[PDB]
Symmetry: none
Subunit: 104 residues, 2 copies
């Protein structure tokens, strides 16, 4: 995964909000990074646009089940991080937008 | 500096890693670019690898002093990015590896 286009490793929440808040990018642009906060968790930061809030980034924690799996909600779990990005690129299922472009 | 072989301008953090993470590059291949995230600072991106994570890129911010100079640590300051690049080619001096190859 150090070699996945969307995996930005251990960047901070500020760094990802800086990399993502760009009005030239389409909503649903995203990156997967490590959670600063929960040791062993990942985060899926996605930009969105709300008429009022304008451009905003949302952060979804991704927890690794003890067996190995990954989940954002109870509806679905993925056996890998790439299956999770793949699924949410086709179905938002709760996220603000389905994932479109990987962060530039 | 726009024509320096090692200077890669405004490329993104993500594009720098795409350039550096490649089998043809020695540990210590590098480039200098603008920091996307901190206007007015630069960034020295260096390829490295370990037998655990494989090839990975380390990013070191380069701050510009108001008096002209540049630094990555309090140990030494440099009057130009040319000076900084030459110093870290002879000495890692904090960095994961001394600078060996200008990124192709």
């Amino acid at each position: 995964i150090q070699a996945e286009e969307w995996y930005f490793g251990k960047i901070t929440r500020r760094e990802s909000e800086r990399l993502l808040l760009n009005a030239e990018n389409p909503r649903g642009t995203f990156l997967v990074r490590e959670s600063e906060t929960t040791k062993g968790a990942y985060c899926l930061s996605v930009s969105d646009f709300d008429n009022a809030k304008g451009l905003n980034v949302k952060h979804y924690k991704i927890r690794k089940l003890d067996s190995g799996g990954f989940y954002i909600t109870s509806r679905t779990q993925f056996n890998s991080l790439q299956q999770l990005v793949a699924y949410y690129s086709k179905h938002a299922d709760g996220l603000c937008h389905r994932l479109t472009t990987v962060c530039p």
